[PDB]
Design a protein around this ligand. Structure first.
Ligand code: NAG
Ligand code: NAG
Ligand code: NAG
Ligand code: NAG
Ligand code: NAG
Ligand code: NAG
Lengths: 151, 206
């Protein structure tokens, strides 16, 4: 996270050149990630001049709300890219029907019915004698549902 | 000092419910009737997985340290329970010559009369912790019997571990890749086990 001028916002890019990309914040040529920037003229800029931001021996930027769009201060955050995964949206669960279920670790087609099994608290899936899944634990509601294959 | 590890050191290999079935699995387990080192903070290695068993009366042992150098050179695991909450940190800590308890960080989590068994293994950067608590009345050595250790903590540390030490009687075992036949009851717990590399009778049973 850094604060730069509006005209220098384009310098935060792979394979870019300029004062910021040369001496302040240099990006790799094969960098993987996203760059998000937004204007901060009503937050960081001051009427008397906000010289708290310095760039390269170093010079300050005259951030003012009465300046132009290119002279307005911009807050730029670069997210450089396993523990940080994307979110997984869940759907509603319908019982007693032939469905294509998708739980945490396995996918399959079957009929989800209420079970009478007593799973251990650390167990998520059940297995039969012939190494097939017969019951699973719902990841949201602590209940055990039998997986009957469709007719 | 060495004691006899008769039938202990068996944990759940996965999170799969099994009922009324004898399941054969291959994983790292403590050998049956093997020698485990008896202690009353020495430097001990982390070769292939370590079984830890401790007997307590006044909560002497507080935690463990896992790593390679543990001298502020690389990332090392610090799991310390300071009597109210279990604290796990993987920072490059600077440890003393003889660490003890009186009377760059990438992850941080804050949570004889008794026997506490532990299993520590690090496979593919994941630190698997299994544990089981039971009351005992015995002093000389570990009680004879069978019990299963359930998994509680899974740490995606991604840190190489070759040396561990114990922070404060306790026993240290080692895990080797042998096949086991696990007996599952109707309630899904492990009630008996057979070490397939113990004796020809166990081989026949397996
Ligand atoms: C998820 O949140 C719901 C609240 O809508 C709660 O009932 C459920 O137990 C939660 N599940 C887990 C695994 O925390
Ligand atoms: C180690 O175990 C063997 C059995 O394989 C036994 O004969 C030997 O006495 C044990 N050593 C010690 C020091 O207990
Ligand atoms: C245990 O240590 C953690 C930090 O390692 C600290 O936040 C906590 O307050 C400590 N608990 C006690 C009871 O001292
Ligand atoms: C943290 O690691 C960096 C290397 O990325 C090193 O320069 C720094 O000295 C380390 N700091 C500590 C406190 O170990
Ligand atoms: C662990 O050791 C391997 C070499 O076998 C090495 O490639 C890897 O980077 C090491 N991991 C850490 C976290 O140092
Ligand atoms: C399973 O647990 C119940 C208590 O909920 C107990 O009554 C029953 O005997 C147990 N069965 C087995 C085989 O352990």
């Amino acid at each position: 996270s850094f604060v730069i001028r509006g005209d220098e916002v384009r310098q935060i890019a792979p394979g870019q050149t300029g004062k910021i990309a040369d001496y302040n914040y240099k990006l790799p040529d094969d960098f993987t990630g996203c760059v998000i920037a937004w204007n901060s003229n009503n937050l960081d800029s001051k009427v008397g001049g906000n010289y708290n931001y310095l760039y390269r021996p170093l010079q300050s930027y005259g951030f003012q709300p009465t300046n132009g769009v290119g002279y307005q201060p911009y807050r730029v955050v670069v997210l450089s890219f396993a523990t940080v995964c994307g979110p997984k949206k869940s759907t509603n669960l319908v019982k007693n029907k032939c469905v294509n279920f998708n739980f945490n670790g396995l996918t399959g087609t079957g009929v989800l019915t209420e079970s009478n099994k007593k799973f251990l608290p650390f167990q998520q899936f059940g297995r039969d004698i012939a190494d097939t899944t017969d019951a699973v634990r719902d990841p949201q509601t602590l209940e055990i549902l039998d997986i009957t294959p469709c007719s | 000092a060495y004691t006899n590890s008769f039938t202990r050191g068996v944990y759940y290999p996965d999170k799969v419910f099994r009922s009324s079935v004898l399941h054969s699995t291959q994983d790292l387990f403590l050998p049956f009737f093997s020698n485990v080192t008896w202690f009353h903070n020495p430097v001990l290695p982390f070769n292939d997985g370590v079984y830890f068993a401790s007997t307590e009366k006044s909560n002497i042992i507080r935690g463990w340290i896992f790593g390679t150098t543990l001298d502020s050179k690389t990332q090392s695991l610090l799991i310390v329970n300071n009597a109210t909450n279990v604290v796990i940190k993987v920072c490059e800590f600077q440890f003393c010559n003889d660490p003890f308890l009186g009377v760059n960080c990438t992850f941080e989590y804050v949570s004889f009369k008794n026997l506490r068994e532990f299993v520590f293994k690090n496979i593919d950067g994941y630190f698997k912790i299994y544990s089981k608590h039971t009351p005992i009345n015995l002093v000389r050595d570990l009680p004879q019997g069978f019990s299963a250790l359930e998994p509680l903590v899974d740490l995606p540390i991604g840190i190489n571990i070759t040396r561990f030490q114990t922070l404060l009687a306790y026993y240290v075992g080692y895990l080797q890749p042998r096949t086991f036949l696990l007996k599952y009851n109707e309630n899904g717990t492990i009630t008996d086990a057979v070490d397939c590399a113990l004796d020809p009778l166990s081989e026949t049973k397996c």
